[PDB]
Structures are given as C-alpha cells and as structure tokens.
Design an enzyme around this catalytic site. Structure first.
Site, short mmCIF file in Angstrom:
data_model
loop_
_atom_site.label_atom_id
_atom_site.label_comp_id
_atom_site.label_asym_id
_atom_site.label_seq_id
_atom_site.Cartn_x
_atom_site.Cartn_y
_atom_site.Cartn_z
N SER A 1 0.84 -1.19 0.00
CA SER A 1 0.00 0.00 0.00
C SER A 1 0.88 1.25 0.00
CB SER A 1 -0.89 0.04 1.24
OG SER A 1 -1.59 1.26 1.30
N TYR B 1 -4.00 0.68 10.08
CA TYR B 1 -3.78 0.29 8.68
C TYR B 1 -2.34 0.52 8.28
CZ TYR B 1 -4.43 -0.19 3.67
OH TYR B 1 -4.33 -0.60 2.36
N1 LIG Z 1 -7.37 0.23 -4.01
C1 LIG Z 1 -6.52 1.13 -3.15
O1 LIG Z 1 -6.64 2.36 -3.18
C2 LIG Z 1 -5.51 0.46 -2.20
C3 LIG Z 1 -4.66 1.26 -1.53
C4 LIG Z 1 -3.76 0.71 -0.68
C5 LIG Z 1 -3.73 -0.68 -0.50
N2 LIG Z 1 -4.58 -1.52 -1.15
C6 LIG Z 1 -4.49 -2.99 -0.86
O2 LIG Z 1 -4.79 -3.96 -2.16
C7 LIG Z 1 -5.20 -5.14 -1.72
C8 LIG Z 1 -6.50 -5.55 -2.52
O3 LIG Z 1 -7.31 -4.40 -2.40
P1 LIG Z 1 -8.63 -3.95 -3.34
O4 LIG Z 1 -8.36 -2.54 -3.79
O5 LIG Z 1 -8.76 -4.81 -4.58
O6 LIG Z 1 -9.87 -3.91 -2.21
P2 LIG Z 1 -11.31 -4.70 -2.11
O7 LIG Z 1 -12.33 -3.68 -1.56
O8 LIG Z 1 -11.69 -5.18 -3.44
O9 LIG Z 1 -11.19 -5.89 -1.03
C9 LIG Z 1 -10.03 -6.72 -0.94
C10 LIG Z 1 -10.30 -8.20 -1.36
O10 LIG Z 1 -9.87 -8.98 -0.38
C11 LIG Z 1 -11.13 -9.87 0.12
N3 LIG Z 1 -11.09 -10.20 1.56
C12 LIG Z 1 -11.23 -9.38 2.61
N4 LIG Z 1 -11.18 -10.12 3.73
C13 LIG Z 1 -11.03 -11.41 3.36
C14 LIG Z 1 -10.92 -12.58 4.09
N5 LIG Z 1 -10.95 -12.57 5.51
N6 LIG Z 1 -10.77 -13.77 3.52
C15 LIG Z 1 -10.71 -13.83 2.15
N7 LIG Z 1 -10.81 -12.67 1.42
C16 LIG Z 1 -10.97 -11.47 2.03
C17 LIG Z 1 -12.19 -9.14 -0.17
O11 LIG Z 1 -13.49 -9.94 -0.24
C18 LIG Z 1 -11.81 -8.57 -1.55
O12 LIG Z 1 -12.02 -9.51 -2.51
C19 LIG Z 1 -5.43 -4.97 -0.18
O13 LIG Z 1 -4.46 -5.60 0.55
C20 LIG Z 1 -5.35 -3.45 0.06
O14 LIG Z 1 -4.91 -3.26 1.46
C21 LIG Z 1 -5.48 -0.94 -2.02
O1 LIG Z 2 -7.41 1.12 0.83
C1 LIG Z 2 -8.54 0.27 0.68
C2 LIG Z 2 -8.41 -1.12 0.69
C3 LIG Z 2 -9.53 -1.94 0.54
C4 LIG Z 2 -10.79 -1.36 0.39
C5 LIG Z 2 -10.94 0.03 0.38
C6 LIG Z 2 -12.23 0.56 0.23
C7 LIG Z 2 -13.32 -0.30 0.20
C8 LIG Z 2 -14.60 0.21 0.04
C9 LIG Z 2 -14.82 1.57 -0.09
C10 LIG Z 2 -13.74 2.43 -0.06
C11 LIG Z 2 -12.46 1.92 0.10
C12 LIG Z 2 -9.81 0.84 0.53
O2 LIG Z 2 -9.89 2.25 0.54
#
Ligand SMILES: NC(=O)c1ccc[n+]([C@@H]2O[C@H](COP(=O)([O-])OP(=O)(O)OC[C@H]3O[C@@H](n4cnc5c(N)ncnc54)[C@H](O)[C@@H]3O)[C@@H](O)[C@H]2O)c1
Ligand SMILES: Oc1cccc(-c2ccccc2)c1O
Ligand SMILES: NC(=O)c1ccc[n+]([C@@H]2O[C@H](COP(=O)([O-])OP(=O)(O)OC[C@H]3O[C@@H](n4cnc5c(N)ncnc54)[C@H](O)[C@@H]3O)[C@@H](O)[C@H]2O)c1
Ligand SMILES: NC(=O)c1ccc[n+]([C@@H]2O[C@H](COP(=O)([O-])OP(=O)(O)OC[C@H]3O[C@@H](n4cnc5c(N)ncnc54)[C@H](O)[C@@H]3O)[C@@H](O)[C@H]2O)c1
Ligand SMILES: NC(=O)c1ccc[n+]([C@@H]2O[C@H](COP(=O)([O-])OP(=O)(O)OC[C@H]3O[C@@H](n4cnc5c(N)ncnc54)[C@H](O)[C@@H]3O)[C@@H](O)[C@H]2O)c1
Ligand SMILES: Oc1cccc(-c2ccccc2)c1O
Ligand SMILES: Oc1cccc(-c2ccccc2)c1O
Ligand SMILES: Oc1cccc(-c2ccccc2)c1O
Lengths: 233, 233, 233, 233
Positions: free
Chosen positions: B138, B151
């Site tokens: 992240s 986080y």
């Molecule tokens: N999109 C962003 O802005 C952002 C920023 C920083 C970090 N990340 C990181 O990217 C990774 C994936 O994020 P995303 O953007 O696709 O978010 P997302 O909202 O799509 O959710 C993450 C995925 O992980 C699954 N998950 C959550 N808990 C679970 C569990 N206990 N068992 C099995 N599956 C579970 C969820 O069902 C979902 O499929 C995460 O680790 C997140 O911390 C994303």
């Molecule tokens: O960093 C992140 C990692 C996973 C999920 C979110 C998110 C989910 C729902 C709505 C808004 C954000 C997020 O911000």
C-alpha cells in the site's frame, strides 16, 4: 499513436539493451552515444532506423541536438531516458584531495548534472505529449558497498531528482527511475546468486515509459539488483 | 513451460483484475474468494477455466486447500500472490480501546498474518519450481494520510515481510510487493490528478511474477500510487 | 515544572537503564515490570521513589492502572515510553504453521498491540500536558539480519505507528522512536566493532522526551545500532 | 579529556548556535566564517576564546587552514561539523539551462563538494583521536516541498555521504548527520505548528558529537523538522 523514446548512454551496456528492447517494442528511438566506435556499432546493427548523435552528455547543446534531431525525424518525443553514467572505482576518502576533487567533478557532472541537462532539453517536447522521464539510478542510491562515497552520493542525488521532479512536474510529466545493480557491462555476489546480463534488466524501463502500463506511476524507483539493497548473504 | 499463479482476494478489485490479466497473459490461475457471491461471478466469467476456493484467508486450512487444489489441477505452482486485505476507515487512536483492539485484531490478522499463512502454505511448492511471491502492500507502507495508525502499521509490517522473506528465501524464491494507492474498488487527490481503475494497476504484478522479466528482482516494492507517496500537491 | 515519565519493560535491559537515567535527570518515574522478581529489584534499588506496577503489558487494564497510579502519585504525565518487547529467535518461515502462528501472536501482541494499548491509556493525560511518546523500535525496523520475518515485520510496524501517530496527534503530542541494535540485555558484529551495554544507548530517549531539547522533533526515529542498519562489514 | 570541535558555517544561523552550545558544553571550538562581518561578530562575542578563519569553504586550503589552526591552538581535533550550505530559492526546472547550470554548480560545490573537502582535511586528525563527523543535511534529504530539485538532490547526496562514509570509516570514525527543517535563519507550516529558532535545533549535534552519549551511533540521520518529513497537515 506512435511512441518515441530518446536514450543517452545508448552505445553500450544497459543503454544499448534499451535501444534493442524499445525498438522491438515498437518505439521510434533516438540515441546519444559517446564516440565514433559506438556510432558504428549502432549504424551497422540498426542501419538507418535510429536517429543517432555523437557527443558528450556534459554539453548542453549535444543534449539539445539530440532532442532537436528526434523531433525533426519523428515529430514528437514521448519519453526521455537519462542513462549515461560513470563509476568511481571505490575511490577512498583518504586519497589526496586533488584526486578526490577531480573525480568528484566528473562523477557529478555525468551522473547528476547531465540528467538535469537532458531533462531541461527534453522538457518542452515532453510537455506537448504529457510524456515521461526515466532515470537510471543504482543500488548505490539505497545501500552502501557498491561504490565509493562519490558514486553513492551521486546516486542518492538521482533519487532526490526523481522525487523532486516527479512532484514539480506532475500532473503532466511522470518521472521515475530504475536502480540496477550487479550486472556486467564494461565483486558481485547478490543474494540471488548471479550477476545479470544487461538484457535481463530492461523490463522496468519499458513499464515506466509505457503509457498504458505506467500511466499511474511517478516518483517511483524500481530496484532490479538481485536483492543487493538488502545486504550481503 | 506452463506457468501457474494463485491469487487471494481474487473476487474483487485488484485481485479480480489480476485474475483477468494473468489469464490473458497465459497463466493457469487459482483464486481464493471470500464468499458464494464472488464465486458465482468468476464461474460465470471464466466458466471452469480456474480453480476456485471459497473461504476465509484467516484460516490456514483454507490456504492449504487453495495450494492443494492448484497442484492437483495444474501440477505445480510458480507464483503466490497474497492480496486479500482490509481498510481501517481512518480509525482514530482516541477511540475507546475495545474498539481499537477489535479492529487491530482484524486488520493484522488479514493484512499480515494471513500473508504469513499463505506463504507458509505455498512454500513447499514454490521451492520445487524456484517460484516467487508477490504481496500487495500500500502507499501507506511508505507514507501517512491514507489510513489510520492500524492500517499504516499493518502495511509497514508487510514491507518488513518483503525484505525479511526476500533475504531468507534467496536464492531459490523471489519475494516482492506492489504498493498501490488511490484506486477505486469497493478522498484521493494524488499528484497525477486522478484515481486509477484497478485494471490500470496490474502491470507491476506481471513483471514481478514473470520468470523472464523479473528473474533479477527480489526485495523490491513498486509503488503505483499516482505520486501519493511524495505528498499532497 | 516537574517532569513525569512512565516506562514499560522497565524491569531489565534498556527499560531498567531508562529508569536510572530518567531518575538521574530529575524526572519522577513510573515503571511497569513483568513479575515479582523484577519488582523486588527496583524496590531495593529505588526504595519508594518510584511508582511500580506488576502485570502483563498485553492487558489493557494493567496499562490503565500504570497511568492511573502515575497521576495519583505525581499529578500528571509528560512522557510515555513504550519499550516492552520480545524477540523471535530467528524463527524460520519453513517451520510448521502452528509454530509460526503461536509465535506471531505473541510477537505482535507485545511489540505492536501493547504499544497501541499503552498509548491509548496514556493519551488523555498527555493531551493535558502536550507531552510525548517514545517507542522502542529496532535496527530490524530498517534492515534485515537481526531477526526472523515475524520480528522484523513487527518492528517495521512500529515505524508505521510512529509516522502515523506523529501525524495524527500533532501539534499537541510528539511521537518518536529509538532503534537500538546489537546491545546485550537478556551474533553482533556491528561496523563499530562492539556490542553496546544498555547504559550506552539511553541518550536518544532523553532527547526525544526532553521538552527543551526535543520540542521540535516528531515523526523521528533515531538509530543507535553501531552502524548495523548499513550492512555487515 | 578536553574535547575540540571545528564548525563551518559558524557565522550565522545554526552554525553560530552550534558555536555557543558547544562552548557552553565545555568544548574548545574553531569556526570557519564567510567574511569580515561575521568574523567581527564572533570576536566581539567570544573575544579570543575561539580559533577563527575567514574564507570560502569551496577552497580546500581554507579547510586545511581551519584544521591546521585548530591543532596548533588546541593540539587535536575530536569532531568536525560540516554545516555551511546554501538554498536554491525553489529554482524551477523550466528555467533557462544556463541559469540552472550556474545554480547547480554553486549548490553542489557548497552543499556537497565542500563537505568532502572539509572531511578530507579533517580526516588525518580525527583518525588520531577516533573522532567523529556531523553533517548538516535537511528535511529535503527525505521529502519534497522545501526546495527546488537542485537543493533536494544536493541534500539527498549528503545522505549518501553519511551512509557511505560511515561504512568506510568505521570502526575508528563515526559519521552522522542532522536534518533540520522549518527554522528561520537568514512558508513553513510544519505539523507541530511553528518554526523553530536556531537554538531549538542544536541538541542532536551535541549527542552525535558526544563521545559518551554518541559512542554507539554512526550512519544515523536525526530529523528535527517539526514533523515536516511526514507531509503537510
Ligand atoms: N485500491 C486502493 O486504493 C488500495 C490502496 C492501498 C492498498 N490496497 C491494498 O490492495 C489489496 C486488494 O485491495 P482492493 O483494492 O482490490 O480492495 P477490495 O475492496 O476489493 O477488497 C479486498 C479483497 O480482499 C477480500 N477479503 C477481505 N477479507 C477477506 C478474508 N478474511 N478472507 C478472504 N478474502 C478477504 C475481499 O473480499 C476482496 O475480494 C489490499 O491488501 C489493500 O490493502 C489498495
Ligand atoms: O485502501 C482500501 C483497501 C480496501 C478497500 C478500500 C475501500 C473499500 C470500500 C470503499 C472504499 C475503500 C480501501 O480504501
Ligand atoms: N551495470 C551495473 O552493475 C550498474 C549498477 C549501478 C548503476 N548502474 C548505472 O546504469 C547506467 C548505465 O550503465 P551501464 O551498466 O550500461 O555502464 P557502461 O559501462 O556501459 O557505461 C555507461 C554508458 O554511458 C556512456 N557515457 C559515459 N560517459 C559519457 C559521456 N560523458 N557522454 C556520453 N556518454 C557517456 C558510456 O560511453 C556508456 O555508453 C549508469 O548510470 C550506471 O551508473 C549500473
Ligand atoms: N538490546 C537489543 O539488541 C535490541 C535490538 C533491537 C530491539 N530491541 C528492543 O528494545 C526493547 C527493550 O529491549 P531489551 O534490550 O531491554 O530486552 P529484555 O531482554 O531486557 O526484555 C524486554 C523487557 O520487556 C519485558 N516484557 C516482555 N514481555 C512483557 C510483557 N508481556 N509484559 C510486560 N513486560 C514484558 C521484559 O520482562 C523485559 O523487562 C524491546 O522492544 C526490543 O524489541 C533491543
Ligand atoms: N534553517 C532551515 O530551515 C534549514 C532547512 C534545511 C537545511 N538547512 C541547512 O543547515 C545548514 C546551515 O544553515 P542555516 O539555517 O544556519 O543558514 P544560513 O542562512 O545561516 O547560512 C548558512 C551558513 O553557511 C555560510 N556559507 C554559505 N556559503 C559559504 C561559503 N561558500 N563559504 C563559507 N561559508 C558559507 C553562510 O555565510 C552561513 O554562515 C545548511 O547546510 C542548510 O542547507 C537549514
Ligand atoms: O556500476 C558501474 C557503472 C558503469 C560501469 C561499471 C563498470 C565498467 C567497467 C568495468 C566494470 C564496471 C560499473 O561497475
Ligand atoms: O533483540 C532482542 C530483544 C529482546 C531480547 C533479546 C535477547 C534476550 C535474551 C538473550 C538474547 C537476546 C534480543 O536479542
Ligand atoms: O533552507 C535554507 C538554508 C539556508 C538559508 C535559508 C534562507 C536564507 C535566507 C532567507 C530564507 C531562507 C534557507 O531557507
């Protein structure tokens, strides 16, 4: 549509590999080489496909000439790859000052000032395409061991440039770098146990220049050093 | 010859995009999804092309089941992508302790412990292919602003895992991460002025898993965050 | 006028040295120790000068008790020093999962969650004095080599806490850390060629807690590790 | 027994404050000042207690003269504090190259090369006492915002020097730095909400030079910037 890259240090090592890889990936390519001997190598290999310039990257007009010939032949510039650089051969701080001083001047003029110079010369044209810059940094941007204090300082300074220029030129121009280490070019353990050939190192440059793969990347430095930033194993 | 990747968090967001991109790039793919609803989405999209497992990544046997079904269907495993994660919704340190404590448990069990768990479960099989791990970190691994202290701490801990495991498992197994930020998934300025869609973020994972493009990369974290690690503009 | 510090992990090692140094520097001091045997050591050494609490830092009410007894005896709290911690004995990721899992729980409950816990419990009172927090991190917050992946991850997570909490609690509360390495307490080369005794390590804590010397410092981590973050020599 | 420090940039700002603080802490002090006007200030304040040298730090013989006069008056040298530096006034990369080039030369000659120069000149004598170096870096060594790309690059280069020289000169000579930011000297929010006066910034230098408090510290950079490395609040 058609993408155009300009590469310094393109006569050898990673630079030469970037010329091949970017040509294979469909780019039109200009290249700055140091001398006649490197110019002959690329003419023979690529015939007239490239735009080639011989000169010293420490001379601004050579950098402007590279940009100018790129535009006139291909019409625009999408990516500048500042890659020319030199090593310090582990020069010790205990050496005579005049020896340190002369070496410092050369390392910092090539590894830092020349990057400023090429970016200045490329900037007007990258602003017209919302293009990008990729800089070659070094494992020595992050860790000790792979050079003397002059080399390491010069490469830490490149990291500074990446962050500072990425911030100032956003949102139009992306600015990123690649930090190779332990690859033979013209001793290197590395935790992955081998030294890379220059061809094994080029993929991060393609990603950072690619308008599709890299559109969301700036301020970033990608190490490709066989783990050497982590320490001796 | 034929490459095999296993992806957690594959039911949505970046995970789902990794499923598509890796399938388009020729990989055989297994996927861990959270629930029935996500399972139905991938069955309908990919029909029986994938190996799919429903369960909680916080449960070791679910992780071992994912590995076991991958091997039995495709015969070997070349890359594990630990990507499941959860956000803390900017939870303030001034909140009641029991509220902080419950949230901490969940963030750290999913964002850190589960990565240890999947890597443990994938390890025997990656050792047989000299494969790799990619972890989703992240922007909050590097910079403040994009989450609460739980986080951010959890994501700093991922960086720790990358460096520590890259060093211990070299030379056989590469261990890298990707640090996305500011991309919508289910407010984000970013110096590049837009929020990325999940598809715009996948190329660094492909590079780090690729045996050709990535053979010399370990210990590395690739930010793809629109410049957000550099600060507000 | 009169300054008051509360220290966990105060029965031994660096914690015990912080008790002495802060008492010698004029502070009123409270201390959390693990057990009866450590309690007897400090009663005999400091007689009734200190406020002492025996308990597990993993228990919130023990942390609240420490704060509560500090206020009742000294009337206010100016600095909380979260220092209790435990090592992972280089536990390998190839070990049985249940062994990794049990160890992870303990390392992360003591080295991370307990810091959240003590800060939560100290926070109301530090807000009344615009006080500070100092956290004990580790060389392993920055570099590999000095622990297994669980320890290193836990200490990277502390760094995350420092940055995240320093940003959220500014301007009233400063939040800093100290990263010791290679000092014997109850093998360590280090480029400076010796292992430090716990007394040799305390000065950075005094600076970060001092209202005069440290008023302009937050978000900061001070390594005191004999150069070990730089690599083996 | 008796400790001796030599400080450049000592005519104003932090340098002048280091002269006072180190004199109050019992050190014998030599000082390099830029001009006659600064020389008159210190003669009037300290009468003949100091050893003072007027000259340009960009001139090696001025640096050797400072060392030579220190030894002849006090007999030995225990700590060199390289502190002279200059700002770039946020010079934009879009400016005419000749303007960038002239400024680059000055920033890098003063902020980097001169540090190499003073360290070279101080080195023989620090080797005879197992002394130390402290370098003044900057918040801009770590973060963007507080300068143009030339300043930031120059200060990133200082960080490089610290790590590289700390590693090469261990175990005899410690090498550390201090990274101030947001303090008025001759606009600065900072998360702690105020700008520091130069006196509020000196304690980290005393710790890093102190043979007792600092004996186990090298390779270290201490930020004292009111949280500015963390980002705008
Ligand atoms: N999109 C962003 O802005 C952002 C920023 C920083 C970090 N990340 C990181 O990217 C990774 C994936 O994020 P995303 O953007 O696709 O978010 P997302 O909202 O799509 O959710 C993450 C995925 O992980 C699954 N998950 C959550 N808990 C679970 C569990 N206990 N068992 C099995 N599956 C579970 C969820 O069902 C979902 O499929 C995460 O680790 C997140 O911390 C994303
Ligand atoms: O960093 C992140 C990692 C996973 C999920 C979110 C998110 C989910 C729902 C709505 C808004 C954000 C997020 O911000
Ligand atoms: N290969 C490694 O292990 C490694 C490690 C760290 C950093 N790097 C960096 O990668 C970059 C390219 O390195 P390489 O491995 O291909 O090395 P190389 O030995 O091939 O030489 C670098 C290239 O730059 C050219 N060059 C040097 N001075 C020049 C000048 N004044 N004007 C014009 N051209 C000049 C050289 O002629 C050559 O073509 C450099 O910046 C280097 O610092 C490489
Ligand atoms: N000394 C080093 O080389 C080194 C290196 C890196 C990090 N550290 C860190 O410094 C801090 C203090 O370390 P030390 O060197 O003085 O080690 P130590 O061997 O003296 O033990 C740490 C202290 O914390 C106490 N403690 C452990 N678990 C506790 C619990 N559940 N409840 C209450 N107290 C508990 C212990 O009883 C002890 O007093 C730790 O966080 C450690 O991770 C030390
Ligand atoms: N005060 C801040 O906010 C801040 C922030 C970041 C970094 N710094 C750094 O701290 C160091 C000292 O800064 P200051 O705040 O006291 O600034 P300052 O305005 O007082 O000037 C720096 C000192 O260095 C001297 N100097 C400049 N060029 C010289 C030369 N060629 N030869 C000899 N002396 C020369 C100046 O005369 C002056 O005494 C510098 O390296 C600076 O880059 C300060
Ligand atoms: O880091 C480096 C950068 C550029 C060249 C070399 C090199 C050149 C010839 C022979 C050996 C090394 C190098 O090591
Ligand atoms: O980093 C560390 C933190 C806490 C304790 C130890 C330790 C304890 C007993 C024996 C040896 C080490 C340690 O190494
Ligand atoms: O970072 C810095 C370093 C040295 C001087 C200044 C400065 C000098 C005069 C007026 C304003 C600033 C500065 O900002």
């Amino acid at each position: 549509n058609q993408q155009v890259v300009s590469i310094t240090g393109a006569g050898s090592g990673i630079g030469l590999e970037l010329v091949r890889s970017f040509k294979l990936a469909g780019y039109c390519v200009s290249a700055l080489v140091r001398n006649e001997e490197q110019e002959a190598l690329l003419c023979n290999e690529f015939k007239d496909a490239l735009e080639i310039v011989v000169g010293d990257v420490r001379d601004h007009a050579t950098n402007e000439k590279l940009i100018k010939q790129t535009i006139d032949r291909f019409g625009h510039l999408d990516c500048f790859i500042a890659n020319a650089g030199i090593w310090d051969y582990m020069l010790n701080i205990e050496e005579p000052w005049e020896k340190i001083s002369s070496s410092f001047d050369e390392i910092f003029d090539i590894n830092v000032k020349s990057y400023f110079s090429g970016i200045s010369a490329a900037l007007p044209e990258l602003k017209k395409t919302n293009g990008s810059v990729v800089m070659t940094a070094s494992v020595s941007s992050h860790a000790v061991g792979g050079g003397g204090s002059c080399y390491i300082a010069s490469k830490h300074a490149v990291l500074g440039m990446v962050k500072a220029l990425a911030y100032e030129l956003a949102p139009e121009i992306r600015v990123n770098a690649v930090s190779p280490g332990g690859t033979v070019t013209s001793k290197g353990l590395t935790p992955l146990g081998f030294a890379a050939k220059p061809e094994d190192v080029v993929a991060p440059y393609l990603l950072l220049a690619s308008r599709k793969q890299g559109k969301f990347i700036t301020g970033t430095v990608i190490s490709i050093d066989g783990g050497m930033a982590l320490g001796r194993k």
